[PDB]
Write a protein that binds this ligand. Structure first.
Ligand code: PD7
Length: 504
């Protein structure tokens, strides 16, 4: 009870408990006594950005990549009992795969027999080559004589075909004690073996919040083990005759409390997407849902982001992001692939998130939004690393939401023009990577007041997936985030700032 207050964490916790009280302890959880997992002589080494090659359009010194991969390997090498991987399909390949294999063999060479889960979400059409039994067989071959001691459960899953829901959480949890999470998929060709690497960020922690994340994953595997009765939803491959492990993380927690490793207070928050759980039946959540039609796109699907109270209650991650932004009293940095979705089949944007940002702009709070360059766009379903044709799609929508709010277009411009910084992502002085390709950005990052930040898998654009991430409140940690990532991103991305329509 010497601890500093957590104004931002307190406001997010309120929201989550109003929206989803019944999911506390499974799909969301606040904890004290976490540690941001950094090695010696590398104090911001808990922040796992890739490629981490600022100021060089040839990206020759990929210090972020190196650290990301050394930390995956080493977390796995330290396993006594359990390894729990979630990702977006394909299953991890190249160096992401080697981290897991080198890590498991090390654990076996230390004398352990680890249980391993690997879970991917699969979109109903690109799958993919995506095959659990082939992937498991590949790991078994790569694992050598170690395979005998490693218990694998390998699954690919789609929770709803019609509502476009599957796992996209990106988690590596070891012994319910350490967790690495964020936006990074195990896709070597996009992240590693390319001269135009995707820019992304994970974070690494240890502590009670690592257990919060395993609890989330047992939630996913309960559904997944049960729904292997339906091969249209789940493909599953186990090794060594082993049963499905719905309960791996509870089994490893057993009956003792998670011990603190540090002093960082953390909120873990995910969502159940569509087709796992209908609602939190214990929730009293009764919002006034938004109403503003979009002039560009009228979504055909039932709109779960903007017009479905039950979905909110099983997807606390949406409101956790909105209330993180709403808690900003001085400034917010948004670093995202996208704020707008591909409409149809999804709503183009989250009305409330956009309302939340327009409120901030009106109130004189500084809003910074950096997104992946529009030049990255496909290909309606590719899905390339942009879902807009120009940054005006974000500022025009801000304008539209500023007009709803205030009544006049001239007040709108003072708040938009005065308080918004909007740009495509760059990491050096050059407009694109040295090989000609544009920089692809895939962060799911929010920072508020250099005090509290989200790093996880949940995008700010509309998506109805199983996602997960962490919210940290710590001035020290957010100072490291500012210095190592956000300042540098603004340094180089300000070159590609948008002046909105209606501004000088
Ligand atoms: C025609 C566009 C409809 C896309 C379906 C729903 C979605 O939000 O997917 C976004 C998701 C987020 O991934 P990450 O966690 O940020 O890496 O991307 C995917 O799940 C794969 C896209 C496959 C297209 C589905 C037809």
């Amino acid at each position: 009870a010497d601890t500093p207050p957590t104004p931002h964490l307190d406001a997010i916790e309120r929201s989550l408990r109003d929206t989803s009280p019944g999911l506390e302890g499974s799909v969301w959880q606040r904890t004290d006594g976490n540690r941001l997992d950094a090695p010696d002589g590398d104090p911001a080494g808990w922040l796992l950005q890739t490629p981490g090659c600022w100021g060089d359009a040839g990206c020759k010194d990929r210090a972020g990549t190196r650290r990301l991969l050394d930390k995956m390997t080493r977390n796995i090498a330290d396993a006594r009992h359990t390894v729990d991987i979630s990702s977006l399909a394909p299953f991890p390949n190249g160096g992401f795969e080697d981290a897991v294999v080198d890590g498991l063999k090390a654990s076996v060479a230390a004398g352990h027999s680890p249980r391993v889960r690997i879970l991917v979400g699969a979109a109903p059409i690109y799958h993919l080559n995506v095959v659990p039994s082939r992937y498991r067989d590949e790991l078994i071959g790569k694992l050598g004589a170690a395979a005998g001691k490693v218990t694998l459960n390998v699954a690919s899953m789609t929770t709803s075909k019609t509502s476009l829901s599957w796992n996209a959480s990106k988690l590596l949890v070891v012994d319910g004690k350490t967790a690495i999470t964020g936006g990074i998929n195990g896709w070597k060709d996009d992240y590693l073996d390319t001269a135009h690497p995707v820019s992304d960020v994970d974070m690494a922690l240890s502590g009670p919040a690592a257990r919060s994340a395993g609890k989330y994953l047992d939630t996913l595997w309960d559904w997944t083990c049960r729904n292997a009765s339906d091969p249209a939803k789940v493909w599953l491959a186990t090794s060594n005759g082993a049963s499905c492990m719905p309960s791996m993380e509870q089994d490893e927690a057993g009956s003792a409390p998670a011990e603190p490793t540090g002093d960082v207070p953390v909120i873990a928050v995910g969502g159940l997407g569509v087709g796992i759980k209908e609602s939190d039946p214990s929730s009293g959540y009764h919002p006034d849902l938004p109403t503003a039609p979009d002039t560009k796109c009228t979504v055909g699907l039932h709109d779960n982001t903007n017009a479905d109270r039950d979905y909110d209650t099983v997807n606390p991650e949406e409101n956790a992001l909105r209330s993180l932004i709403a808690s900003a009293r001085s400034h917010v940095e948004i670093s995202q692939q996208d704020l707008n979705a591909t409409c149809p089949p999804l709503p183009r944007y989250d009305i409330r998130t956009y309302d939340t940002l327009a409120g901030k702009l009106a109130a004189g709070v500084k809003v910074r939004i950096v997104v992946s360059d529009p030049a990255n766009r496909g290909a309606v379903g590719s899905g390339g690393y942009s879902q807009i044709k120009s940054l005006d799609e974000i500022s025009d929508t801000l304008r539209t939401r500023l007009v709803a709010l205030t009544g006049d277009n001239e007040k709108a411009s003072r708040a938009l023009c005065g308080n918004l910084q909007l740009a495509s992502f760059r990491s050096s002085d050059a407009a694109k990577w040295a090989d000609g390709k544009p920089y692809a950005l895939h962060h799911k990052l929010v920072s508020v007041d250099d005090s509290a930040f989200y790093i996880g898998s949940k995008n700010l654009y509309p998506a109805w997936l199983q996602d997960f991430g962490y919210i940290v409140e710590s001035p020290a940690a957010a100072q490291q985030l500012k210095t190592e990532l956000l300042d540098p991103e603004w340094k180089y991305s300000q070159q590609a700032a948008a002046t909105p329509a209606g501004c000088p």
